[PDB]
A and B are shown apart, each in its own frame.
With several copies, the nearest count.
Chain A
Amino acid sequence: KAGSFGDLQSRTSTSNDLYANTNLKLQRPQAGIVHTPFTQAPSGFERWK
């Protein structure tokens, strides 16, 4: 779950198998022209550091 640290939970590095919710929320790009921003909350891996 997202709202805690360890919100990314990838199994082993011999795979890219995981659980991906870090509150990664795609949103509109800057100035109304193409690219994919990843808007990621202060959550795991940001907050509590």
Chain B
Amino acid sequence: DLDTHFTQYKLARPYIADCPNCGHSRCDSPIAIEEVRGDAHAGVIRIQTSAMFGLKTDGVDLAYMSFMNGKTQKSIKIDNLHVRTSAPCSLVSHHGYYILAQCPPGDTVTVGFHDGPNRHTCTVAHKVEFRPVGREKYRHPPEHGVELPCNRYTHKRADQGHYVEMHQPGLVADHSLLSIHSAKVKITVPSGAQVKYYCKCPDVREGITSSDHTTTCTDVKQCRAYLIDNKKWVYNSGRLPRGEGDTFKGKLHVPFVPVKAKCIATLAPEPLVEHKHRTLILHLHPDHPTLLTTRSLGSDANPTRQWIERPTTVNFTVTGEGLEYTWGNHPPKRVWAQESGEGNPHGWPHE
């Protein structure tokens, strides 16, 4: 946790990037949101900031806040941060470049810490959906029913079980790096890197790099402020390009995997199992939409589909090898056919 995972921390730096709904002409957001993951079955939503909050880059505490300002970190308290999704979140934990925060699902994610005259936010689109597993399908539970086995994220920071391709704290401009070679723009390393570069003026424009520098064209804005870091690994972002000079393709994990636990889930009461002769009479009266379905057994498949969200008596014709009845996404019930109501011959399916 705070013990071993210096895989990401030491061998990374937060990376300053950019975001569309910011500044006076777009602020450089070192908290640039890529890869929102409300895609699970959960209730907790995973966000990736460009920033590596967590440990500063040090050993302890997931409640500091290291984003990039400059080429340098800005290792301060996490109390200026606001994770939000499409409702205000309460952070759960950050690990890597990735933060887990407890809030409802959301079509967008909207993160931001006040800094400057502006409120310095960053937002992004990504289609998100939770669901309780099984029959009852929702975008996230309403507030009712039983918990039953679907994906959900853990409280604790370390929550491995997946890996994303990591390249490095890739190519982003940091013009704090960029000195001047007496009139031409000179790139420098963030932390040790083969720094990818070109200008309109000659060098290599493929991003085949072993410390590219182009100091032939005067302008800082006519050159490629790019950073292939060569012993560091961070999340692959679209707002953090990679090169090919000494890029890694090394998969290095993602923490905050939604894992099998007891997800908050669904089920609406009142099945009201009743059986008169080969038939389950069922008075039904759910709290919230219940996907009912059954299987009158045998080689017989006998499906049923019906959302039940208000009082309805239904029936399901039990047979010689039973029927099952599945009031929601809770597991199948079971029923033998036969008359309740006293007094008959017996001993065959003929009497």
Contacts and interface: CB of A to CB of B under 8 A. Distances in A.
Interface of A: 2-3, 13, 16, 23, 25, 27-43, 45-47, 49
A33 B239 CA distance: 12
B218 to A, nearest CB: 24
Contact of B285 (A35, A38, A43): A43
Contact of A35 (B26, B124, B165, B283): B124
A38 to B, nearest CB: 5
A40 B20 contact: no
Nearest to B129: A46
Contacts of B125: 29-30, 35, 37
Given A36-B238, A39-B142, 20 more contacts: A16-B165, A23-B270, A25-B144, A30-B43, A31-B264, A34-B20, A34-B239, A35-B32, A35-B33, A35-B34, A37-B125, A37-B126, A39-B127, A39-B143, A39-B145, A39-B288, A40-B127, A41-B287, A42-B310, A45-B129
A21 B239 CA distance: 21
- Residue picked from B19, B165, B285, most chain A C-beta under 10 Å: B285
Interface of B: 17-21, 26, 32-34, 43-44, 102, 123-127, 129, 131, 137, 142-147, 162, 165, 238-239, 251, 264, 268-270, 283, 285-288, 309-311
A25 B229 CA distance: 29
A29 B20 contact: yes
A42 B131 contact: no
22 contacts: A3-B285, A16-B165, A23-B285, A27-B146, A27-B287, A30-B264, A34-B17, A34-B18, A34-B20, A34-B239, A35-B18, A35-B33, A37-B126, A39-B142, A39-B144, A39-B287, A41-B285, A42-B310, A43-B311, A46-B129, A47-B310, A49-B131
A39 B268 CA distance: 9
Nearest to B123: A30
A32 B269 CA distance: 20
